Symmetry: C5
């Protein structure tokens, strides 16, 4: 077979629709997610038109190999989609209604800047290449774009699944390609990060500050150094859940800044001891007493500045 | 081929049955499990009827492509099932008995709220989309729903495998869909959590409380800080076995609450030392003496409140 | 192509044989192992019989699609076997000799109770479902059950590969089913556990006991608490190599019991200090002196009791 | 079918082109990356020629099986490429234009010497082996070599995608082989290594140096030994992201050198204590005072020497 | 199809050749490696003989299904080989030249005894089973055995790729089997183990020995216990890269022996303190002074003995 010929000189319009059945495996490091959906296609092929009466039937059913089917492909899939044709219907005027069901691993970049309070726009790009006989163009049938209410993405809130109606028409290797952008809007469920990372990380930091109510160098060194090690453990744990970004993430910035606090705390603890040994506890006591206020204050201020820069 | 035509204007009833042979790989993080089972289908196709007394055979055997087979699909599978047709039998009155063996990776959400004392209802959804000639409707043949006695799910107790007999009939993209809910009821074997997580976690906590029978700041700091680090290790280990939830889990709450105990123990240890240095050991001794009782008591009470809120 | 019909009222006997070529990937957590073997099948089909003198051959060779082949399946495989037909031979009296080669991931439960001094019986279950014309029954041709001398299972000693000759005949969904049990007997190579887990674990424990020859609370706290943390590391490491069992494993019991020793050691260390501060070193010295003997003795006794309960 | 026979005694020229659609999964340990691209092929087959006037068509379209297609393979792919034929176009003079969409996992060695400030040249090798009738030779059609502007490789900057126009023609197992080198030039986004590994590693080192302003052996031992352990954690973490190389990597050298600093710091801390106990604090104070300068200075000098040797 | 019949009573000789294109993924724990190569086969089938003149061509080209091809299989592959036929050539006398290209995951045992200074002989076993008509025998065509110059195996040096020319002919399940042994000789690049495991491990050990120049029990306990924990971390890290062996590995022995040194060091540190408290520093000083020499000496001697037993 070959493509439906033009009546007048017009491009062939392939109407499309994606209906999400399942969404799973949003992998932050790989920047991929897996989808399981219906793909619907619709186009006019006049060669397939018929008389309702001489057949006695309102619609005709075909097998894929029997008719011409436009070669619709996904741009951003890892390995080309697993596809099962569900139904092919032809109406009297030769309007074809194709329905497949597929599953794919979609590669879509994520913006980690506000992690874990980030929102993402995942994209599924539909595409078609024009042939020599005629030019093919994609369109969105809004009636056939949706998601079943059971669709869930573990650790995320699904906001919407919509399509940008106007295709992106452009030339690639001397042929026209018509590209569609289906968008899945999601936002991260930051809840668990509070009792699992943020709060534990703040507790160990506050514990380090008890060194400001102690004159025991040996105890202070144990406090500050031990808590610093627990901070390293959380830092390492966090970096395991994320890809390496060429920018600072919100959490990443908080985590980095905290190292500076531990470093300055070690200096204070060192200075206090040095002064104590040099028989000048009064200077030492001033620095420690200032530290009790300066540390929580500078910490609270730096965090406000950061939240501001990031949100 | 095409679907069996109606006598009167009835929808076509496809009787279904799932018989579990193997169940494995319950993955808590992915919220999936793998199943290996028989899928049986039964429907009436009059065009296939024949005579027993004369045809020489009480039953006729067909190959999949020889007859019409309803396109039954699973809703919540990750990749569309691996399927091997075992047998196709036709009775004289045109009743078809289809039997396949399949294996699938099923996506079903889990409720972690009571982890590790949780129970789950795993779902396997059967579905069929109606065609233009006729409407297809699913039904459960209870005689063909079961599981072999040997079915085990590592780390879980299998309660039952049953089907909700009433299909969910609804319209999707202007066609009828008929959906069935097969349910696998399981409950977690919490045993191992006791010697592996809970008890070790309580031991390290109780060890931190020995600081209440010591006046040595340097020793107390080592006790409380060291045990806190071991607590972090268990917290980290626990979060590895679970997905991130938008709610607190039972274990998660116990784990979080314990951080508060360590934090307050550091304050007490700090207060006691401060008073000792300020030449007021009698105040310090009162606080420590109260702590010996207040800590186990408030801990035991807080745990009762939590068990109540969660169970 | 239907099954061979009976002479008299007999079921069809399918003779089977499994010959292990390769054995690999015994996964303790998944409770699976992978096999690569020959599967031989043999049955009588009269329709295929011929005269040696007329045909000019004493053996006829067929392609799978040309003749009837019984549908033999494995019960406990994860995904239905990867199969390659090697040869099909027919003798003049119509005896068929089928030979395939396959590889499968077999799910077989393991008894962890005596880990790492455990032995296991892995099972490979062959099965056949009876058809409407005749009943199919499995049998073992002992001549065709074996394993090549080179078969190895990393971290295990291969004892035997045998079959239970008497099939388990039972009814499933109103049809006869004939099941065979091929058994692969293996025993764990416990060697590496001695220098890698057991001995290091005992060393750190004995190191904790040096606290019984010290009056330094600050040092004792460091000794006992540090070694307890290293014990936690080994406990965590061990639980990574094993699935969660609803029973105590040998190693698991030793590991759990050791926590009690650390706990009691912390109490002793605490009691000794308390007495020392209260100006009663003589009482403290008695308790420490008893501890030097009580600890190794109670440890050695408890281990004898455990080894007895488990072996 | 067989290859187009030669007019004169010429080898057959297959023009090639690779156009990157997606690039992902650069795995440093496996030394592999995944690509998703267009592969275009073009060659002269006279047997396919036709008259443009007599035909009325400007172009003829064929299915893969209908004509001879050169067997183009990739040298350095892990598993044989997933390939979907998009279009086959033949012009009046018999010039075929083949276009497929493929995805492959490419094995290409990486030079870790300057990690994480390294740049890499990834290679994709196209190959064709000559047939008995004629010799096949590859060529690059520069018009059909490129990458879509959206191409990204997580944690890397994509510099260029070009082909070495000139094929490597050589003999292998007595037939000619024509090989093409497509090159993807990338450079690592070293940014994240600064707040995640380098700076934390320097902080803990500087913390160890506070021991040079302390006369407390017990405190100094805690400082130096604790920070050394955190250094080990970073070393271990780094080696997880890299394969084992028969050469030192930049980071690897910095990491190794730092161990020497910790070792020498322990010696200094030991020497200082020894002298203090022997009632010679003046000697001890000289060594400590020199250490305060010698350590940062020797560290800064050694790093300059290293950066020089590596860059 | 059936095999070519014998002229006299000879067995059919299938000439073989393996030419390595790529080698990757040497997995020490699984004891597997992945290969990507050419498999060439040659035999003669007189039934395929043709007259160049009557046929037009000097050489004939067939598709696999058109002629008889010997069923060559690999013994030690995990999943039965991914294979694509490149060319089938028949010359006038009926000499067939088969060429495929394949990729496989090969299971070959490794000898870890000298790890990481070990060398290995990896095996690829080709096999063929005889049929009833005639006996098939394998042979090596040395002209078709090799590896491309670019073949690399990450973390290993490739020594040679050769075949044992003499097949192993034997009987299995009443038929003849002809087996060939292709050998890939490799040796481990031990370099990285020196700065990453060995040296760091020695540094921490030497750090523990500084306790022999200190009279501070509290400091000595911190030194020895802390370094022992870092030793455990390296031990654990090492055991991750290796399967569990029923024998001691070189590294494994060094690692185990070091535990004894830590243990004895703790005893010395304990003895020294005990004597100090009992008002006998002179005895304590003798033991410490001997320790300073005995420890490095016994360590250096024990390592020579080990190096001797293993090399
Ligand atoms: C450690 C330091 C404190 C860290 C907490 C930062 C939270 C934050 O700042 O995150 C902010 C986000 C919501 O922001 P948004 O939805 O992006 O709004 C963007 C709209 N603007 C740009 C117009 C403003 O989180 C939350 O609603 C819940 C925060 C609970 C934090 C509990 C601790
Ligand atoms: C330290 C804090 C203590 C933690 C212990 C929590 C156990 C618990 O309290 O959980 C209770 C669960 C059983 O509850 P269920 O089967 O879900 O019943 C739900 C039915 N309702 C809805 C009517 C309530 O476990 C057990 O059978 C007992 C295990 C003993 C735990 C030993 C420690
Ligand atoms: C910490 C305490 C030490 C733990 C060691 C327990 C080992 C054990 O006692 O386990 C027993 C196993 C053998 O088990 P079996 O072959 O099933 O014999 C059961 C036979 N009955 C039922 C008749 C009694 O030991 C060994 O072959 C060697 C163990 C070397 C241990 C070195 C440390
Ligand atoms: C720990 C001690 C610090 C180590 C930092 C060394 C980085 C370096 O020195 O590397 C420099 C590289 C650039 O190298 P290039 O692009 O390959 O230039 C090759 C040109 N030649 C061949 C002439 C030399 O990165 C940078 O410009 C930014 C480095 C910021 C590091 C901040 C910390
Ligand atoms: C703790 C002590 C450190 C252990 C170092 C043992 C190295 C060794 O002794 O190993 C020796 C192997 C080479 O062995 P081969 O090539 O297999 O020789 C087998 C042939 N014979 C048996 C006939 C001799 O490595 C080396 O080239 C030396 C590496 C030096 C690393 C130093 C740090
Ligand atoms: Cl696609
Ligand atoms: Cl499905
Ligand atoms: Cl099977
Ligand atoms: Cl390829
Ligand atoms: Cl094979
Ligand atoms: Na300490």
């Amino acid at each position: 077979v070959s493509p439906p010929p033009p009546i007048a000189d017009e491009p062939l319009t392939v109407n499309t629709g994606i209906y999400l059945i399942e969404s799973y495996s949003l992998d932050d490091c790989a920047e991929t997610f897996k989808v399981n959906a219906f793909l619907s296609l619709s186009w006019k092929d006049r060669r397939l038109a018929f008389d309702p009466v001489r057949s006695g039937v309102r619609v005709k059913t075909y097998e894929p190999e029997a008719i011409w089917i436009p070669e619709i492909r996904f741009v951003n899939v890892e390995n080309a989609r697993d596809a099962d044709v569900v139904d092919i219907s032809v109406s009297p005027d030769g309007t074809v209604q194709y329905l497949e069901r597929f599953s794919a691993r979609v590669l879509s970049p994520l913006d980690f800047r506000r992690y874990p309070f980030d929102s993402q726009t995942l994209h599924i790009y539909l595409i078609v290449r024009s042939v020599d006989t005629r030019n093919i163009v994609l369109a969105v049938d809004l009636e056939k774009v949706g998601k079943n209410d059971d669709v869930f993405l573990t650790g995320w809130d699904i906001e919407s699944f919509t399509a940008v109606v106007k295709p992106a028409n452009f030339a690639l290797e001397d042929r026209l390609e018509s590209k569609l952008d289906y968008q899945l809007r999601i936002s991260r469920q930051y809840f668990s990060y509070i009792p699992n990372i943020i709060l534990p990380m703040l507790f160990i930091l506050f514990i380090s500050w008890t060194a400001f109510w102690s004159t025991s160098y040996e105890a202070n060194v144990t406090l500050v150094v031990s808590t610093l090690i627990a901070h390293i453990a959380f830092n390492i744990l966090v970096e395991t859940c994320l890809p390496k970004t060429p920018y600072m993430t919100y959490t990443g910035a908080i985590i980095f800044m905290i190292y500076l606090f531990y470093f300055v705390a070690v200096i204070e603890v060192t200075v206090q001891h040095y002064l104590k040994v040099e028989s000048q506890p009064a200077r030492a006591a001033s620095i420690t007493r200032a530290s009790r206020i300066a540390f929580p204050v500078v910490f609270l201020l730096a965090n406000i500045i950061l939240a501001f820069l990031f949100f």
